[PDB]
Amino acid sequence: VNLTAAEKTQVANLWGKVNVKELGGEALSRLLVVYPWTRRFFEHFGDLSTADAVLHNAKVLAHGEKVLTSFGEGLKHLDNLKGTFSDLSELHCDKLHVDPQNFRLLGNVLVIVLARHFGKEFTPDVQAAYEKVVAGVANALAHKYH
Amino acid sequence: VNLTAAEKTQVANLWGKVNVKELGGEALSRLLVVYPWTRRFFEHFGDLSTADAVLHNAKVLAHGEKVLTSFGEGLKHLDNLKGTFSDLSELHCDKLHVDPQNFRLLGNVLVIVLARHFGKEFTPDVQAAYEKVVAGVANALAHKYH
Amino acid sequence: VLSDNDKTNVKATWSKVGDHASDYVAEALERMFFSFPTTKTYFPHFDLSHGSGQVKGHGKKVGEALTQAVGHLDDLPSALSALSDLHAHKLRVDPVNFKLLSHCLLVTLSSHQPTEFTPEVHASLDKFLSNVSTVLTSKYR
Amino acid sequence: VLSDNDKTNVKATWSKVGDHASDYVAEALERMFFSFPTTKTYFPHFDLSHGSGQVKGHGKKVGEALTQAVGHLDDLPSALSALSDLHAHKLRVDPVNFKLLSHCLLVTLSSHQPTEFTPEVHASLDKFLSNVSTVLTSKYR
Ligand code: HEM
Ligand code: HEM
Ligand code: HEM
Numbered sequence A, B: 001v002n003l004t005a006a007e008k009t010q011v012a013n014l015w016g017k018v019n020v021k022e023l024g025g026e027a028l029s030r031l032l033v034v035y036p037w038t039r040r041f042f043e044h045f046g047d048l049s050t051a052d053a054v055l056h057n058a059k060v061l062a063h064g065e066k067v068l069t070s071f072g073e074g075l076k077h078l079d080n081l082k083g084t085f086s087d088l089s090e091l092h093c094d095k096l097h098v099d100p101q102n103f104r105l106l107g108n109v110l111v112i113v114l115a116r117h118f119g120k121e122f123t124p125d126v127q128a129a130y131e132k133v134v135a136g137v138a139n140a141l142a143h144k145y146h
Numbered sequence C, D: 001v002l003s004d005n006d007k008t009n010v011k012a013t014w015s016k017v018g019d020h021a022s023d024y025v026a027e028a029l030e031r032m033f034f035s036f037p038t039t040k041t042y043f044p045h046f047d048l049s050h051g052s053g054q055v056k057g058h059g060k061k062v063g064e065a066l067t068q069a070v071g072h073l074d075d076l077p078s079a080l081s082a083l084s085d086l087h088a089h090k091l092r093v094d095p096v097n098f099k100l101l102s103h104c105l106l107v108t109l110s111s112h113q114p115t116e117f118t119p120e121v122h123a124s125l126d127k128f129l130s131n132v133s134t135v136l137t138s139k140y141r
C-alpha cells in the first residue's frame, strides 16, 4: 500500500491506542447489525436472529478480536499486505467461502469504530490513512480468490 | 493483468477482427444511452437529447473510435497497463475531471458490444479473459487520480 | 421508474428469448462464475463445471423467476415476495453480486440476439435487472 | 424501507446534532474529498483545501437538505424533489459517489456523538442515508 511517512506514524500511533478485544468485538458486532446478511457466516456461533443476540454472543465478540488482531498484523507489513494475507486469502476463499465484498464492508465499519472511540483525534487526514489501509487489507484478502 | 497464454491468444485473436470505428462508436453510444448521466462530459458534442441523436452524433461516434484505438494499443501491453495509460490517467483526472467509475461502466458496455458482434465465438472463457482486461484498463486509468 | 416503453422493451426482449430462458440463464451463471469468481463463494455445494446438473437446475429456477418478473412489471415487489424473503433471510447474497449476474445476463442476451439488442433495448433491460435486484434485496435490513 | 424505530433513531441523532448540522456536514465532505479523492472530480471549481470556506458554504446547503429530509421521513421523494431533478439533469453525479459521502456522514456523527451512535442507531442512519441517495438518483434514467 502507498502511504506517506507522516501517514504511517498516524496509522501506528492510533493503533497503539486500540483495544482489539473491545473494538474487535464492536467492529464485527456492528457489521452483523448494520449489514444483517453478513451474519450468514457465523450462524453456527449461536442465536444471531436479532441485533441484541448478536451483541451478546461470546463467539462473535471473540472472533472480532481475532479479526482485529490479524488486521494489526497487516499494519506491521504495510509494504506487503499481499504476502502477509496470502494464506488467509486462500483460507477465506477455499475453506470459508467468504465473499470478499465483506472485507470492504468490515473496513468501512472499522473506520466508523475508530472515529467513535477517538473523536477529534481521528481527523479527516487520519481517516484518509486508514481508508487506504482498510482497502489495502481488503484487496490483499481478496487477492488469492479464484 | 494476469492472463494465461491461452487467454492472451484469445484476447489478441478476437481483437484482430474488431472494427475499431464501428464497435467504438457503438460502445460510447451505448454508454450515453444506457447511463445517461455520462453525457455530462459531452455537452459540447452537439445533440444528445434523444437516444437516436446520440446514435447519429458524429462526434460521439468519432470519439468512440478514438477511445477503442487507445484500448487496442493497451492490449499490446497487458503486462503493464499502468505504465501504458499513466499519461491518459493524469489527463482524465487533471484536465477532463472524469470520475473513473465511468471507465468501469465503459468496460461493461464494451464486453456487451463484443458479445453482440461476435455471438457464440465470445465464449464464457473469452468473456472471462476480456473481463480481466477491462478491469485492468479501468484500473490503469484510475491509477494516477489524486 | 420503469417507463411504459421500458416495460414494452423488456417483454419484447423476453418474448424473443422464448423457450431458451432456462438455457440462456444457465449460460449467464456460467459466464458469472468464470468471469467473476467471487460469486462462486455462494455455491461451495455446487459442481460449477460446464454442464453440471446443479447449475442447469439453478438456471432453470432463476429463469422462471425472471419470467414471472417480466409478467408482473407493474408490481415486482408482489411477484418476487417469496424470493425477496429467501434472499434476505437465508441466502444473503451481498447486493454487489446481483449486478454481476445482471451484467452476464445482458452479455448472454446480446450474444444470442444481436440485431434485437438495440441501445434503447439494452437501456431498458439494464433498468429492469437493476429493478429486480433492488426488489430481491429490499428486505435485507 | 425505514421502520418506525429507524425514523426514531434518525430524528434522535439529528435532534442531538442541532445547530451543528452545517459544521458536521462540511466536515463529512472534507473527510470525503481527502479519503476518497475521486469525489473531487465533481468539484474542480472548488477550493478543496483543509478548512475550506467554499466547502463550508456547500456543507450548509447539504445540511439544510438533510434537515429537510429528517423532517419529512414519510415522503423523502417529495421533500427532495428539486434536488433529485438537479442531480439527475445537471450535476449527474455517478450513483457510486453517494455512498462515499454517506460513509463520511456516519464517520462524522459517530465521532461527535459516540454514546448516541449505537449499532442500532448506526444501522438506522445508514438505511436513511441510502434512502436519501436513492431519492437523489431516482430520476437518473
Ligand atoms: C470482513 C468480514 C469477514 C468475514 C464475514 C469473515 C469470515 C470469517 C469466518 C466465518 C471465519 C471462521 C470462523 C469459524 O468458522 O470459526 C474467519 C476466520 C478468520 N478470519 Fe475472517 N472474515 C472477515 C474478514 C477478516 C479480516 C478483515 C481479517 C483480518 C485480516 C480476518 C482474519 C481472520 C482470521 C485470522 C481467522 C482465523 C483463521 C484460522 O486460523 O482458522 N478476517 N473469517
Ligand atoms: C468511459 C468513460 C470515459 C469518459 C466519460 C471519457 C472522457 C473523455 C473526454 C471528455 C475526453 C476529451 C473530449 C474530446 O476528445 O473532445 C477524452 C479524451 C480521451 N480519452 Fe477518454 N473517457 C472515457 C474512457 C476512456 C477509455 C477507456 C480510454 C482508452 C482506453 C480513453 C481514452 C481517451 C483518449 C485516447 C482521449 C484523447 C486524448 C487527447 O487527444 O488528448 N477514454 N476522454
Ligand atoms: C449473482 C447474484 C445471485 C446470487 C449469488 C444468488 C444466490 C443464490 C443461491 C446460492 C441460491 C440457492 C441455490 C441452491 O442451493 O439451489 C439461490 C436461490 C434462488 N435465487 Fe438467487 N442469487 C442471485 C441472484 C438472483 C436473481 C437475479 C434472481 C431472480 C431470478 C434469483 C432468484 C433465485 C431463485 C428463483 C432461487 C431458487 C429458489 C428456490 O429454490 O425456491 N437470484 N440464489
Ligand code: HEM
Pocket (backbone or CB within 6 Å): D039, D042, D043, D058, D061, D062, D065, D066, D083, D087, D091, D093, D097, D098, D099, D101, D102, D132, D133, D136
Ligand atoms: C447524498 C447527499 C447529498 C445531498 C443532500 C446533496 C444535495 C445538494 C445540495 C443541497 C446542493 C446545492 C444546491 C443549490 O442550492 O444550488 C448540491 C449541489 C451539488 N452537489 Fe449534491 N448532494 C448529495 C450528494 C452528492 C454527491 C455524493 C456529490 C458528488 C461527489 C454531489 C455533487 C454536487 C455538486 C458538484 C453540486 C454543485 C456544487 C456547486 O454549487 O458548485 N452531491 N447538492
